Amino acid sequence: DEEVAALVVDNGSGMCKAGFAGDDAPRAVFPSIVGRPRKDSYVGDEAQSKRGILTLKYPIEHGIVTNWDDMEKIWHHTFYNELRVAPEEHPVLLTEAPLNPKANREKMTQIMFETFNTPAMYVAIQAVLSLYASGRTTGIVLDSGDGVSHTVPIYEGYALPHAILRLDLAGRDLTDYLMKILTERGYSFTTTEEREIVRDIKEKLCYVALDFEQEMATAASSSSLEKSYELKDGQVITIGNERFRCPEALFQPSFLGMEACGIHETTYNSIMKCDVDIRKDLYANTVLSGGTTMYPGIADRMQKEITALAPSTMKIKIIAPPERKYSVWIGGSILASLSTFQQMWISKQEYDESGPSIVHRKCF
Template sequence: MYSCLDFTYNLKETLRGPRATAATTQREYLTNRCQGPANKLECGFLLTAIEPPSIESPPLAVTARPTNKGVPPRKRTETTSSRSIVRAKRLEMTDSLHNAPIVLDNGSGTIRAGFAGDDLPKCYFPSFVGRPKHLRVLAGALEGEVFIGQKAATELRGLLKIRYPLEHGIVTDWDDMEKIWEYVYGEGLKTLSEEHPVLLTEPPLNPRSNRDTAAQILFETFNVPALYTSIQAVLSLYASGRTTGIVLDSGDGVSHAVPVYEGFAMPSSIRRIDVAGRDVTEYMQMLLRKSGYVFHTSAEKEVVRLIKESVTYVAHDPRKEEKEWANRTDPAKGVEYVLPDGHKLKIGAERFRAPEILFDPEIIGLEYPGVHQIVVDAINRTDLDLRKSLYSNIVLSGGSTLTRGFGDRLLTELQRLAVKDMRIKIFAPPERKYSTWIGGSILAGLSTFRKVGYNLLAYSFPWAQFTAESRG
């Protein structure tokens, strides 16, 4: 009997699944394990015998020993053959490490994927899974239990019950997350996961268990040859061409400020709040309901998100804006938005009230500081000698920072909170919606990238030892 991490297999039973096929004897088990079509030493599992060994072990991560005394000893030529197969698989995996890495920017709201060295991601779509909410009655109807990608986000949206597997940067449904990754490889990139190393992004201060489970799935299910994880904000700084600065990254699930000086990140100075674009969407949905426009299904919530991205803006002075709307001195400020069914919405003060929660989360009852405050707090947690350089290199990243007026309002708030006469400079790259992915493409395209991270052969128990994370 073999113990494979937390799995135990009998030698004489037929094994199913991605880890082994038809292991009726010890010799067949090892041969099939190395020769499987979708197998590159599988997950690099370390197999150990429960009973005393009597056969010489092949090299690398596989140790084979018989458990039945009746099994005849293997000939020298057979052992050499097994060793040759293992060596061949090792060389094959080494070749795959030299293929172009895949950069996987796993955002809470959207997923961006592509090959290292490219200017823009090849695959970009909302990171949700849609399931039909109506009964299929025609034989020629759409087939499939789940729908993912641009088609699900546009044509089929009204037929689906939509669910995001990520909330505030943390995966809450790994089955759906795995389906999204399958779509990325099969339909988006049209490549085999076994042939490319992966750079995976994540927000800072995420639970270690989230990263480890992601690595477990990528190694076991997708058989990726190597994996490296990096903080999203650090990659955004790569994309800006700077080695010193503080990145304010506000996406769909998380907003965070990460200071970096001469290429060194300062983990103790990182500040994060779980207030971002999805919270703005939900607040916009509530404000529209108060105005008489009800959007209650998950598909209609996606319509609200599109409204938010089209018409909202951040007020330079929210109190002044509120007074103007209260006195109705400028009714022309309201805008019309045409719904998919042709109806027109008249949207007024909701345009600036919804994104205001980014600067004042207490509006929706959350005891978080605003995005401007986390920038100042992060800088104040660094040494005195570094603060001047950080204030003059503030880099914006993430889709929520694309809201009109965001940069101007941030500058005003920082000038109010910072030391008098402090020189503050904010950089807002026009491509900041993709900044994290672009930075990952730059990093993974370096010749030294293959030397970092953990590969398939290094994958072993316990889980907490097999993932690599960026230190800066």
């Protein structure tokens, strides 16, 4: 093979996923955190490990880069520590959030070519990559991560900006809500250390009820839904209706004091903002992606809720790939490996010729 390996980097609000194009899974996954004393800068797992003596910064907020100096440190960490490669020796495919500001796209481009000297690079919308990973070029993606959720209508490979909706309700909000209701139960989960424990409980024992009220009634009249969780010190606690009450906030944000529509309504509203001619394709291809869509039972619940909102004659189909926690990254691996995509990379030559703004023409 004459070609060097291409890198695929998916930066998220809570976790970054990095690897090599062609692989079926990322080689490294670490927290999107940079810390400095309360080496001078700590990044990823080590930063989390030593958070006690550091002041942490989160470069990506709600999917958007807001601290470029620390974002640069996360990328440096990715190349040299996690993947152990030299960026000037490999093309790099980066991911971005839906509706990412123009100026941000140009900044990412300039940094890759001028700071890391990448031989080539490209930036793709996260939701679009997840759609590709499911074998589709048309459909609507509900991407819910740790800091933000988006409903992104995509037609023939192109996202529709006017119909994209953003919901600032995701994994982090759900973790804190579980800490709250478990505390109301009689336990006490309030510290940063305890937040990590509860995040684990959430990922291991939570689920989406098909019928909220019936589930609440079953939990109130029996112990059939209770599950046990063992703490490090050995204490075993019980989780009951909290198991499904936590993710229920996705469908009813008022539980969190938010007036926003739930994920089902948001999905429906995005579809209605699209041209009537493509709505049926979207209803028949609603794909879930992101860690927060991993809850058991979420696909069937979405099927039920959307069916209730859409015309009775509409064919509804919810797709929930088993590997959807990393579908964004996998889609990127697939894209960067495609024969027809090789001509799409922005080369150092092209960057030198057109500058940062070339990203708007090359990465549409």
